[PDB]
Design a protein around this ligand. Structure first.
Ligand SMILES: NC(=O)CN1CCCC1=O
Ligand SMILES: NC(=O)CN1CCCC1=O
Ligand SMILES: N[C@@H](CCC(=O)O)C(=O)O
Ligand SMILES: N[C@@H](CCC(=O)O)C(=O)O
Ligand SMILES: [Zn+2]
Ligand SMILES: [Zn+2]
Lengths: 258, 258
């Protein structure tokens, strides 16, 4: 009767509240997906408990063991009933889990430290003075790995072999690396995260250029699960009532520091 | 074995080829959705015949007879197997048909004749010198009808009662009205259509302001139909291989005249 909602610590989607160590259960957390989970659970009429995914990953299949990790894995192996997180709707995932229609629309983007001489993916691909990378084990990495587009192929060949590794284990590590590298590292990440960081002190990074693709995040359920339909309709209702727009404003812009 | 694909004449999604009267069947048509249909049918491995929806409408339920019209109706009553068209994914439709994940992301937008003193929905709502309207029987009209947001409520109250009618029967009639009204009519339509028109001679209209919402178009099938899964995966594959981006470029920008 209490359903398990797997999610991930990723600002501003899910973050610890300032006094979290003095709190328990759902009250430990705040952010866009915490609010999204509350609203969906209210429409679908369920009790639920937030659970930060143990391995801190979004979800990918190990090509050897064929085992899924991350939140995708929580759903696949029946350890979580729903995932409410910035989880990208992709073909390979759609084969093994279900997704609501998108609750946010976004694309892969470039983050630079301000002043960096880079305006586009082409600009990065044609030089080597500025290193660039992505989050490990997520959809952005897979994008470069799978792309058959020339410039992206070129970027992948550079990233796959770059030493020291340019694949970070969290988005926050990528951001720090941009910020500490004096313009010699750029980060490839989703425009939503990029746009949030750009609005936060020290206000030293910015998104450059257009997005590389157009896609969306979806609330996910195990394949064939009974919750999938209600959740989907809940997402569409929140979209049409403007709640999703409201929440984006709340967590990105209303508190903008730059 | 030959499946019926309902669609709608709406530039640049489906248009008559220049010498259509000398042609037959699928060869009569060209445009983004014609290409989209071809690509999906190739992945799903089906033969199909394009069929322009008889009533020229997207789809709405008559509140009296409770009968669905337009392409939604073609699917609901089993006269078409698939719809490939700029058909907006909405809650009420999702109750009676299925939709792939979105193949295009868009939002409601304002089109003005260039020079018109209007920058926003607020600007329209607070004056009456400039009339404004929408397409009849589509999702934009429903948006205003259903909105609980102040400015939009105000716009709806004006449109619902405006005389002569501001609800056009096709998008093209709305555009003509903007173009012939010397700045005294603005049109509320999806940003995709708005963006296409803006790139076409006489180059006398433009999109102003941000979009009013964020949503998407989806390929639609009757509820519970076996084609739904394959079509969905086909859409995600085309998205990830960049075909959808390619097609948008082909039909909007590559041939831009402004
Ligand atoms: N070739 C393109 O412009 C591709 N784009 C543009 C915006 C979003 C996207 O996927
Ligand atoms: N309040 C908002 O900004 C709402 N927006 C912005 C862009 C798209 C959308 O639905
Ligand atoms: N949203 C991504 C994670 C972030 C990224 O890969 O840039 C995913 O679902 O895998
Ligand atoms: N795409 C819309 C039609 C255009 C509009 O309403 O602006 C629909 O599916 O109803
Ligand atoms: Zn501590
Ligand atoms: Zn003729």
């Amino acid at each position: 009767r209490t359903i398990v909602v797997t999610t991930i610590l990723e600002s501003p989607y899910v973050m610890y509240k300032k006094n979290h160590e003095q709190l328990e259960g759902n009250e430990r957390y705040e952010g866009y997906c915490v609010d999204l989970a509350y609203e969906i659970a209210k429409h679908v009429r369920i009790k639920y408990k937030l659970s930060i995914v143990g391995d801190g990953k979004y979800g990918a299949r190990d090509p050897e063991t064929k085992i899924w990790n991350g939140m995708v894995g929580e759903l696949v192996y029946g350890r979580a009933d729903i995932a409410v997180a910035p989880l990208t709707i992709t073909l390979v995932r759609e084969e093994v889990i279900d997704f609501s229609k998108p609750f946010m629309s976004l694309g892969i983007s470039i983050m630079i430290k301000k002043g960096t001489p880079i305006e586009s993916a082409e600009d990065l691909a044609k030089q080597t003075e500025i290193a660039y990378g992505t989050l490990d084990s997520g959809s952005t990495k897979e994008f470069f790995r799978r792309s058959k587009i020339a410039v992206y192929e070129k970027m992948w060949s550079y990233m796959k072999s770059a030493e020291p590794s340019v694949f970070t284990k969290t988005t926050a590590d990528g951001v720090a690396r941009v910020r500490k590298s004096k313009g010699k590292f750029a980060f490839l990440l989703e425009s939503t995260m990029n746009e949030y960081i750009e609005q936060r002190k020290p206000c030293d990074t910015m998104k450059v250029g257009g997005n590389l693709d157009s896609k969306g995040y979806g609330v996910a359920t195990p394949k064939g699960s009974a919750l999938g339909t209600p959740v989907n309709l809940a997402v569409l209702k929140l979209s049409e009532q403007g709640i999703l727009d409201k929440l984006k404003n709340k967590w990105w812009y209303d508190k903008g520091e730059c």
